[PDB]
Design a protein around this nucleic acid. Structure first.
Lengths: 107, 96, 124, 79, 53, 57
RNA sequence: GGGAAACUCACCAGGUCCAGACACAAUAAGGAUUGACAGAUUGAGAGCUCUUUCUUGAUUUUGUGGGUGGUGGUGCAUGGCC
């Protein structure tokens, strides 16, 4: 016997917003299309990693500065899924550039 | 390089067995990853092999990438005295 | 011919190199005799003042165990048979030096010619 | 594991830049034009895009097995 | 075997170096990328550091 | 600078066939009584243990 | 990206090490060569060097060609960046 519900948690973190929203939309439809219950995709505050460096390799010139930045977007979906449907949704929704981390046991 | 024959055969055994060795450009490390000699013995024995054919080297971000060639495969199946059709991973791997 | 005139010795020494048991040299070999590692000892005859022969003949023929020998000449041919091949179109063309004592340890191998000279010395 | 998402995604970028430099040196003759890397469960995939894959692969994939071995040694993946 | 070839380098500037070019001076150690400023300026689009504002 | 030697013939071999181990051997477990101990000024000293085991003798 | 106690460090007063590939020629298993306790010595528990006498075992040493390294020079030989 299989299919017990466990209150699973998906965390989706990425640097490309479109692939992240495609995978989040993927999971929310792939939960609702066969009827889980969900605390749907909660947008966390997008963190901006800034690195400020001089433009020049030597020290000559007027001091010009350069602020590179990498944006990082997170989401998390709380589902209540049976362990088979857990396995199904956890293996699927792979994307180049989206990171999925799935935890159990909401205590 | 002056090094023990035990360690030179350790390097050459690992190189014939693997066909390939990565090695951090870090002298005075006292332990190579996956060989139990110095890192310097690895780097210098592989260089002494490079000058006589037998292996090629790329550098690429502080990490010597050594790759055994065919002339080397002959030379150190001769040197380790294994029978023909024994080794390095010229592999026709089952699951890959 | 049809037989091999101490080239059986050449073959067991050539196999004795490669699994690390051919202790060659005077000092390396007399250090092997003074512990229980010696399995087959090979000296030579044509040396000068023969205290080297005297020492290795005393230490290999103790009246305690492990007692073989052979007295074949030509330490330089014992070098071409023992461990230094610098062939280069192997009609010899090499820089060969003499060896004059060679001692075999564990001979890591098997049958025939081992057994041939083993019976040939250790049963008369 | 036990790396923050800042450090993890930065190290994923640094792993991509390292792979790109290593392949720009190793496969420059075959016209290597850029990798992409896809993490999956149990496998991380490295799609080389060269133009001359008949000389990236080799005799029954002998060359790409070396590159798989090189990358799995240097970044210490399990084989 | 030489115990006269070393000296403590647990910290400072000589303890660490750029992983691209082994340079000591001018590292970027933010988020542990440990590239110097000049090689970061080249590898920045590959690491994923883009110039927006 | 490696002062050379004549040979190592530091055994007293008598006539037929008794040998004797002059300069008694190292007792340490990592030196299977093949190596010798040097005798400087009372200084019994092992060379295979490259540093350790200087004996008083 | 220069807020340098050591490192950085490129300067000074000194001591180590070769990390001198490869090939040739020489020496040489009657040992080519490695290392070292204690003392003198040195800033130093560096056997660096010496007394000495063990160890080591073809890896190395000596000469030639030829390499490698250099925060050495020329930014008025250049790339790239600024």
């Amino acid at each position: 016997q299989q299919q017990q519900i466990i209150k699973i948690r998906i965390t989706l973190t990425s640097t490309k917003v479109k692939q992240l929203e495609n995978v989040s939309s993927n999971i929310v439809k792939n939960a609702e299309q066969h009827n889980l219950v969900k605390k749907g995709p909660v947008r966390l505050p997008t963190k901006v990693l800034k690195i400020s460096t001089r433009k020049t390799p030597n020290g000559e010139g007027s001091k010009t500065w350069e602020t590179y930045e990498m944006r990082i977007h997170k989401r998390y979906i709380d589902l209540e899924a049976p362990v088979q449907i857990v396995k199904r949704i956890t293996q699927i929704t792979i994307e180049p550039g989206v990171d999925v981390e799935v935890v159990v046991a909401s205590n | 390089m002056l090094m023990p024959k035990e360690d030179r055969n350790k390097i050459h055994q690992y190189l014939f067995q693997e066909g390939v060795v990565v090695a951090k450009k870090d002298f005075n490390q006292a332990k190579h990853e996956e060989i139990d000699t110095k890192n310097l013995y690895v780097i210098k024995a592989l260089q002494s092999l490079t000058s006589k054919g037998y292996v090629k080297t790329q550098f690429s971000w502080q990490y010597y990438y050594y790759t055994l060639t065919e002339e080397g495969v002959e030379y150190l199946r001769e040197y380790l005295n294994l029978p023909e059709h024994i080794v390095p991973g010229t592999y026709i791997q089952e699951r890959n | 011919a049809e037989v091999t005139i101490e080239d059986a010795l050449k073959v067991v020494l050539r196999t004795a190199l490669v699994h690390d048991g051919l202790a060659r040299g005077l000092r390396e070999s007399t250090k092997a005799l003074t512990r229980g590692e010696a399995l087959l000892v090979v000296l030579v005859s044509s040396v000068t003042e023969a205290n080297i022969i005297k020492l290795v003949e005393g230490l290999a023929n103790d009246p305690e165990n492990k007692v073989p020998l052979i007295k074949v000449a030509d330490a330089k041919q014992l070098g071409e048979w023992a461990g230094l091949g610098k062939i280069d179109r192997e009609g010899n063309a090499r820089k060969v030096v003499g060896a004059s004592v060679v001692v075999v340890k564990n001979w890591g191998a098997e049958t025939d010619e081992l057994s041939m000279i083993m019976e040939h010395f250790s049963q008369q | 594991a036990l790396i923050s998402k800042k450090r993890k995604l930065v190290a994923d970028g640094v792993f991509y830049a390292e792979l790109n430099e290593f392949f720009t040196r190793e496969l420059a003759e075959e016209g290597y034009s850029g990798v992409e890397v896809r993490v999956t469960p149990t496998k991380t995939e490295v799609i080389i895009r060269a133009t001359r894959t008949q000389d990236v692969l080799g005799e029954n994939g002998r060359r790409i097995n070396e590159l798989t071995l090189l990358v799995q040694k240097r970044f210490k993946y399990a084989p | 075997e030489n115990v006269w070839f070393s000296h403590p380098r647990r910290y400072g500037k000589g303890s660490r170096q750029c992983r691209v070019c082994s340079s000591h001076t001018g590292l970027i150690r933010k988020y542990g990328l440990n590239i110097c400023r000049q090689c970061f300026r080249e590898k920045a689009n590959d690491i994923g550091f883009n110039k927006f504002r | 600078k490696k002062v050379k030697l004549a040979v190592l013939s530091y055994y007293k071999v008598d006539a037929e066939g008794k040998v004797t181990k002059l300069r008694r051997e190292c007792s340490n477990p990592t030196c299977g009584a093949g190596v010798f101990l040097a005798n400087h000024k009372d200084r019994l000293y092992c060379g295979k243990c490259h540093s350790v085991y200087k004996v008083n003798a």
